[PDB]
Ligand binder design. Structure first.
Ligand SMILES: [Zn+2]
Lengths: 98, 1111, 175, 195
């Protein structure tokens, strides 16, 4: 699971709702993608940085922390975990159906 | 001849052509004339169907009007479609990128049936694009050409099928009308019939004929001989018209309870109402001809009628009985047979008129919907046609048609022939057509009806083979959409000059003769048996007295691109096909020498291609210059033809125009004034006349390779001027504005020498790959300024340089001088797109010489890349000492079956060296049929050869016998064509003579400069980290799974893993490998591909719990 | 009201507030109503005159109303590839500038080690090389037991020795 | 045929509850990019549209349930939710495919894993590779069997880091950046080290 090219088997099976909410880093609940003016993603939208990580490397939403020295700390304001920027390719969302 | 400035082209043709070739652009001009309804077309129909002279726009407007409300007391109508002058002439709309178009005006009549008032408002319909004299539209500056389409004409189509179980024959029908619901009548596997309505597999004819107000007595009276339908009507199992109506309602509109009247009105609104089922004006006449319903009545009521249905039933049921002729009660008798779907009597041709008509019809349908919505929401007498009209959908529809549609495509213009052949081309793909995947093997085949209508040779070799073709040279489009060809009619063995035009279906009921028949000038063929084309396309012998038609001329079955191939009849069909296709993609050289051996079609093709200046009105020339010509007409006034010099074609070739007249000559109306890109003296010239030896030379001309002498490079015989354009726009941005300025950060000065203070390259300055072109500087905004950057500026005092230099640079692998700069901007009060405020476009041209890898070919199918260009010393030379220019292999011509070009080579040598036939003791036996004035030919004399009536073997052999020398006494070639030639490498003479002679070669637009590409580390795609593909982007070759098979079969595992992970995908692997190779360190272990992780996340998103387990 | 509100804030891939989707709709209606009466496309300055607002705002709203396109629509006349195949990933590492940055870091380390150790440390923590944060003078004093004026003086010594052409030429090339 | 799936659900320790679905995952945003093209135009992978439809239907169903509506409207909303998840997982499998602008079927998750254009046989099995080129071929009759000709420009572009190192070592260029500048300008010294 560490992705070091040391694999013994690959397994596929049905995914229950408990696994689906386990993978997700948050619950997307707004059909909002990009602010038409600010050109930034929104909160709890399809592109939310809190759920899927920060777009720019090592910055939160309002730019409280713009420095490398902040690693692994989730800001108290928007909850954007200040880290590397390709987590947007890794983290995941989920929708709770009515 | 019959052309005022025609060069003297002697011809080997035996018989004469009764009619000249029509203007080969007549299928584009005439259709647009019908669309507009110009006075030329108005008088054209005056003697060709004046029973109802109506244009396409007039037809659409008349069909649309009148439109009313639900009450019927208030309505609107349209009439009088009047055009207007074009906004700007062609060249300026080609300059500033505006569509060549004119305003459209129509009159609207507002009627109010409640009380009655009139409102005749001349509403501005919109901006209709127009068609130029060349038959090409201009959209946003670009030159686009629409092509005609081949589709199944709506009508009735009976067909036969074998069940393959008991070998019972079955007959089916498909009345396929445009914009309607299908009906499929057939005989089922068992005895009864199937009447499938809109894809519902129930309910034999019993319920249908009953639903038409009939009962059992009518169906039993009409059908007492057809035991099949008797059994069917016995198996009715339903009694009652309302019962049949509700049974139909089951399988026509389920999900809603039926009522007594709903089904009766539903049937009429489904089939007999011209809003949901309207077979076009073509379809109604096709049905009438197929069934003999109406034979002398005007065309009206396009909707399908009930007698049509009953006639379809009778025809089908009689066909199942094996009957020959059906006589419908109340109509003429019609023979009963299955209908072929590929016969050109059932495949129509939607020209530009029909396509634009359909788009206008969609626009007017939206117009009717919106006006119907609006006419009720507003109170009466407060409503006006202008507020009833919102012209937006019409212009939206025309813009939708002209752009982003695959049936109106970018003009393929790199020589006059390509432009000529792009129009007058028949396509089959697109809306209403069949895709290549949807295309079967049967459609791609050549139908016997293709003769004279569509050329059977000209078709692309790719996947689209047979799907798209080219129009014939004599072909005509009927005012009805069907294709049609001329043919002379012979009576009792007397050939008439009267030319009558026949369609594909009219040919079957007649017998056409051979094109080149032994005519005695009295109309009587010397032998009774003559090659004729029968009804079903069969060729057979038949006595003369019963034939009734003949071909107007040879080369009637062939197009204009294939009519330019000399000795066509001596070539295989495949090689002729490829030769005709490579004729389309020759390049315009800088001299364009006319070919020695050719066909009379070259002159006409060059003349009517539209790119050679032709004096419209006769008169003396006032003055001549490179830029322009002033010609004084006889009636006092003068006219100035403004020559077009060094214009970039759509494929980046040259389009110079050199005048060929003097300051004091007289020119007649129709004479060629100036030559285009690939024309000499107004006739087509796509190549050069090169001396050819056909020996295989030391393996440098191996496997279709071709070797050339350095004379071609030094004398600029094969060199092409190539022009490219580079757009670049400065646009508004939240960061501010991007400036076209020289304030370019961190640049040297030797590269700033050739820029003006305005910020762009000086005109006439040389650039190359990587040089800057325009200085455009964008506000960089902000980023992480590296601390190392701060120490860097602290060491030298360099400014922060707050802006990003995304200037325009010459892309990889090209160079040359700059030709022109065009700049537009908002403060120039121009019509720039909203958002951009500067836009500059630079033209860079280079004189591309001929080098290795460039493709050269003849017009006989032989092709090949330049194997080498070896110096003039190492060339086999004749006893006179003239080195050969081009050497081709001898192992390709006999296997590939293209011996025609050897005959062309010999005829070219005869035409170059000159000849004379000794008419001392009478004419020789071979020259008896040879025409006069062909017994003597000066050196470098041009000849001609019609494709199917040309120089025979005996005539060519006799010409080769007497081939008088030019200056010295030296008959270089012997009677059999071969000649001695001295080796230039070793020096001794070659043991055996080889054939030599002048061949017409052409340079193709597949040059190696635009074909070489390589990359080390370019950009990558977004979703997967694989590098992109193409030449515009930095590219990277696709290593597909088929090559993975080869690498796995080799047993090479490390190479495969390298090619997959680090060379393509693994990002950290990529950067680490690059660092290691630069640092001279060992390449590290490959990692895990990123695309696999992308796949894993994608599969997880599909609710599939996929986890990889270490142990 | 419900339909209009929903179409306003729900029918767009890039959601737009109703307060200015209103002015997009009004701009469109007035421009297409004036186009037929005047016969030509209405220049945005005249549209602004009908707006009683500055034209620049009119161009801004015109470029705001433009909707996004699809990455997967076939782009060619013939169907062979999608649009997304032709878009370069800007965020990807160049793989050439990375090695350049590493070698620049090596050159900086060599240059600093050539200088005196106190000066090297002073500038290193002044521009935050070894750590994530550059520091003010008083931090340098607290870590070296000197006054802030002395740190200003040693910084003066640093960039004075750093202007030496021996380092200036060897580092200026790296651009 | 029934036992073929019943035994699989029995012997394997997975509950068949996963057949029905009440919590739908959302792919990472970078796998469904929204990128601004040169010109202000924006591009999306059609997945944002399907996800937006799912979100809209779910939110409206939540509003209907909380507000209290007649069961017909609630049933219609639940059907729309089912069809929206249907379109998201596999567009066009049931009924007419969900269509966007230009009248083309939208690319669902399933369509991204099917056929030639799917990920499996287009990006996984065979990939576009670096350090590669392509050009026209010409007969080389003077070459040896183990040899092959190569254009000078293509060889330079291929072996860029190799000649970069081999020339920065021979002191032709002081640093790597100077080596890159020489290579792109094609200085005469480049050809010798290239050979
Ligand atoms: Zn934040």
């Amino acid at each position: 699971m560490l992705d070091v090219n040391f694999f013994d088997e690959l397994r596929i099976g049905l995914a229950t709702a408990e696994d689906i909410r386990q993978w997700s880093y948050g619950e997307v609940k707004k059909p909002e993608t990009i602010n038409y003016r600010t050109l930034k993603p929104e909160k709890d939208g399809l592109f939310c940085e809190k759920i899927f990580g920060p777009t720019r490397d090592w910055e939160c939403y309002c730019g409280k922390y713009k420095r490398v020295r902040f690693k692994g700390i989730i800001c108290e304001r928007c909850g954007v975990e200040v880290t590397r920027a390709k987590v947007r390719r890794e983290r995941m969302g989920h929708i709770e159906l009515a | 001849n019959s052309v005022p400035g025609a060069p003297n082209r002697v011809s080997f043709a035996k018989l004469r052509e009764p009619l000249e070739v029509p203007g080969l652009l007549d299928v584009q001009t005439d259709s647009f004339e019908w669309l507009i309804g110009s006075p030329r077309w108005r008088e054209s129909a005056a003697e060709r169907g004046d029973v109802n002279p109506v244009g396409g726009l007039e037809e659409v407007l008349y069909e649309l009007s009148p439109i009313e409300d639900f009450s019927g007391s208030m309505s609107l109508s349209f009439s009088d479609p009047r055009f207007d002058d074009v906004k700007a002439p062609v060249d300026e709309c080609k300059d500033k990128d505006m569509t060549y178009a004119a305003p459209l005006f129509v009159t609207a009549e507002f009627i109010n049936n409640n009380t009655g008032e009139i409102k005749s408002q001349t509403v501005f319909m919109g901006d209709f694009p127009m068609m130029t004299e060349k038959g090409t539209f201009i959209i946003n500056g670009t030159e686009r050409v629409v092509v005609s389409q081949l589709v199944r004409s709506p009508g009735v189509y009976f067909d036969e099928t074998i069940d393959k179980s008991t070998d019972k024959t079955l007959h089916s029908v498909k009345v396929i009308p445009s914009r309607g619901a299908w009906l499929e009548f057939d005989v089922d596997k068992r005895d009864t019939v199937g009447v499938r309505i809109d894809r519902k597999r129930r309910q034999p004819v019993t319920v249908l004929l009953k639903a038409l107000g009939w009962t059992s007595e009518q169906i039993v009276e009409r059908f007492g001989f057809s035991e099949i339908m008797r059994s069917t009507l016995e198996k009715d199992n339903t009694v009652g018209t309302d019962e049949a109506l509700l049974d139909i309602y089951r399988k026509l509109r389920p999900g809603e309870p039926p009522t007594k009247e709903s089904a009766q009105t539903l049937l009429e609104n489904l089939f007999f109402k011209e809003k949901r089922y309207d077979l076009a004006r073509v379809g109604r006449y096709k049905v009438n001809k197929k069934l003999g319903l109406h034979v002398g009545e005007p065309i009206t009521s396009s909707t399908l009628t009930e007698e049509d249905v009953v006639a379809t039933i009778e025809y089908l049921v009689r066909l199942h009985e094996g009957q020959t002729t059906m006589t419908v009660p109340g109509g003429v008798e019609v023979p009963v047979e299955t209908d072929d779907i590929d016969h050109f009597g059932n495949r129509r041709l939607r020209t530009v008129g029909e396509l634009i008509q359909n788009q206008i019809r969609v626009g007017m349908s939206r117009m009717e919907r919106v006006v119907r919505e609006r006419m009720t929401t507003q109170d009466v007498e407060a409503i006006t046609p202008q507020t009833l009209i919102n012209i937006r959908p019409v212009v939206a529809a025309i813009k939708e048609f002209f752009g982003t549609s695959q049936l109106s495509q970018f003009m393929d213009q790199n020589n006059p022939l390509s432009g000529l052949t792009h129009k007058r081309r028949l396509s089959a793909l697109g809306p209403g057509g069949l895709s290549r995947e949807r295309a079967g093997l049967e459609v791609r085949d050549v139908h016997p009806s293709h003769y004279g209508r569509m050329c059977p040779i000209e078709t692309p070799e790719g996947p689209n083979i047979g799907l798209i073709g080219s129009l014939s040279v004599y072909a005509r489009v009927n005012p009805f959409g069907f294709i049609e060809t001329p043919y002379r009619k012979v009576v009792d063995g007397v050939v008439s000059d009267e030319i009558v035009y026949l369609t594909a279906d009219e040919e079957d009921r007649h017998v056409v003769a051979q094109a080149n028949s032994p005519i005695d000038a009295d109309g009587r063929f010397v032998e009774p048996r003559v090659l004729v084309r029968r009804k079903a396309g069969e060729v057979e012998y038949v006595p003369s007295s019963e034939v009734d038609y003949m071909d107007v001329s040879p080369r009637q079955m062939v197009s204009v691109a294939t009519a330019m191939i000399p000795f066509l009849e001596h070539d295989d069909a495949n090689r002729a096909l490829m030769g005709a296709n490579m004729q389309r993609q020759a390049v315009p050289l800088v001299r364009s020498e006319a070919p020695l051996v050719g066909t009379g079609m070259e002159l006409r093709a060059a003349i009517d291609a539209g790119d050679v200046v032709v004096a419209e009105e006769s008169g003396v020339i006032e003055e001549v210059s490179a830029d322009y010509i002033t010609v004084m007409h006889d009636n006092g006034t003068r006219r100035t033809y403004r020559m077009r010099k060094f214009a970039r074609s759509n494929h980046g070739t040259c389009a110079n125009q050199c005048p060929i007249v003097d300051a004091g000559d007289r020119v007649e109306a129709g004479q060629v004034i100036a030559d285009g890109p690939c024309t000499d003296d107004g006739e087509m010239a796509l190549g050069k006349n090169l001396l050819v030896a056909i020996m295989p030379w030391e393996g440098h001309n191996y496997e279709d390779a071709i070797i050339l002498s350095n004379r071609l490079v030094e004398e600029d015989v094969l060199t092409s001027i190539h022009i490219e354009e580079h757009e670049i726009d400065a646009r508004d941005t939240k960061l501010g504005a991007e400036e076209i300025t020289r304030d370019i950060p961190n640049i040297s000065d030797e590269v700033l020498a050739d820029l003006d203070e305005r910020g762009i390259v000086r005109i006439g300055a040389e650039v190359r790959d990587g040089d800057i072109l325009v200085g455009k500087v964008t506000p960089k905004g902000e980023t992480e300024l590296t601390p190392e950057e701060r120490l860097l500026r602290a060491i030298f005092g360099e400014k922060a340089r707050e802006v990003r230099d995304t200037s325009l640079k010459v892309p990889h692998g090209e160079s040359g001088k700059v030709i022109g700069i065009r700049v537009f901007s908002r403060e120039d009060e121009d019509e720039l797109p909203a958002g951009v405020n500067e836009l500059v476009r630079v033209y860079v041209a280079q004189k591309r010489k001929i080098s290795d890898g460039d493709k050269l070919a003849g017009r006989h199918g032989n092709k090949g890349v330049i194997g080498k260009i070896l110096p003039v010393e190492d060339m086999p030379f004749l006893a006179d000492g003239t080195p050969v220019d081009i050497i081709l292999n001898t192992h390709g011509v006999p296997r590939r079956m293209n011996i025609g070009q050897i005959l062309e080579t010999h005829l070219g040598w005869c035409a170059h060296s000159g000849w004379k036939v000794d008419a001392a003791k009478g004419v020789p036996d071979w020259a008896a049929r040879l025409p006069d004035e062909l017994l003597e030919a000066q050196p470098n004399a041009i000849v001609s050869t019609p494709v199917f009536d040309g120089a025979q073997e005996a005539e060519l052999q006799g010409l080769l016998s007497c081939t008088l020398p030019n200056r010295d006494g030296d008959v270089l070639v012997d009677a059999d064509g071969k000649a001695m030639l001295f080796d230039g490498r070793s020096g001794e003479p070659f043991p055996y003579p080889v054939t030599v002679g002048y061949m017409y070669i052409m340079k193709l637009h597949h040059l190696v400069d635009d074909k070489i590409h390589a990359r080390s580390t370019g950009p990558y795609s977004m979703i997967t980290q694989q590098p992109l593909g193409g030449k515009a982007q930095f590219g990277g070759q696709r290593f597909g799974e088929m090559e993975c098979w080869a690498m796995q079969a080799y047993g090479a595992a490390y190479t495969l893993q390298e090619l997959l992970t680090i060379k393509s995908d693994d990002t950290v692997g990529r950067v680490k490998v690059y660092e290691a190779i630069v640092k001279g360190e060992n390449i590290p272990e490959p990692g895990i591909p990123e695309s696999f992780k992308v796949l894993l996340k994608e599969l997880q998103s599909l609710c599939l719990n996929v986890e990889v387990l270490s142990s | 009201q419900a339909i209009t509100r929903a179409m306003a804030d729900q029918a767009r891939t890039i959601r737009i507030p109703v307060h200015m989707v209103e002015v997009i709709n009004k701009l469109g209606r007035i421009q297409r109503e004036l186009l037929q009466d005047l016969g030509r496309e209405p220049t945005p300055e005249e549209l602004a005159k009908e707006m009683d607002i500055t034209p620049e705002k009119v161009l801004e709203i015109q470029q705001y109303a433009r909707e996004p396109i699809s990455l997967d629509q076939t782009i060619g006349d013939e169907g062979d590839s999608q649009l997304g195949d032709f878009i370069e990933d800007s965020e990807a590492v160049v793989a050439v500038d990375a090695v350049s940055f590493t070698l620049l870091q090596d050159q900086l380390q060599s240059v600093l080690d050539t200088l005196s150790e106190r000066e090297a440390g002073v500038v290193r923590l002044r521009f935050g090389l070894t750590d994530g944060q550059p520091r003010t003078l008083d931090e340098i004093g607290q870590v070296y037991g000197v006054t802030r004026e002395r740190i200003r003086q040693i910084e003066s010594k640093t960039m004075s020795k750093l202007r030496h052409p021996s380092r200036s030429q060897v580092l200026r090339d790296y651009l | 045929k029934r036992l073929k799936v019943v035994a699989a659900f029995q012997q394997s320790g997975n509950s068949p509850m996963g057949m029905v679905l009440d919590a739908v995952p959302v792919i990472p945003p970078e796998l469904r990019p929204m990128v601004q093209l040169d010109g202000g135009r924006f591009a999306t992978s059609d997945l944002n549209d399907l996800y937006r439809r799912v979100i809209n239907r779910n939110n409206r169903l939540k509003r209907l349930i909380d507000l209290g509506a007649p069961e017909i409207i609630v049933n219609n909303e639940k059907r729309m939710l089912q069809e929206s998840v249907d379109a998201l997982f596999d567009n066009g499998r049931r009924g007419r495919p969900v269509t966007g602008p230009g009248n083309r079927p939208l690319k669902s998750l399933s369509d991204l894993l099917k056929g030639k254009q799917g990920r499996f046989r287009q990006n996984l099995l065979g990939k576009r590779v670096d350090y590669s080129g392509r050009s026209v071929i010409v007969v080389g009759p003077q070459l040896k069997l183990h040899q092959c000709g190569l254009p000078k420009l293509m060889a330079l572009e291929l072996f860029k880091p190799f000649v970069m190192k081999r020339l920065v070592d021979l002191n032709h260029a002081q640093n790597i950046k100077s080596a890159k500048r020489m290579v792109e300008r094609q200085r005469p010294q480049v050809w010798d080290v290239l050979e």
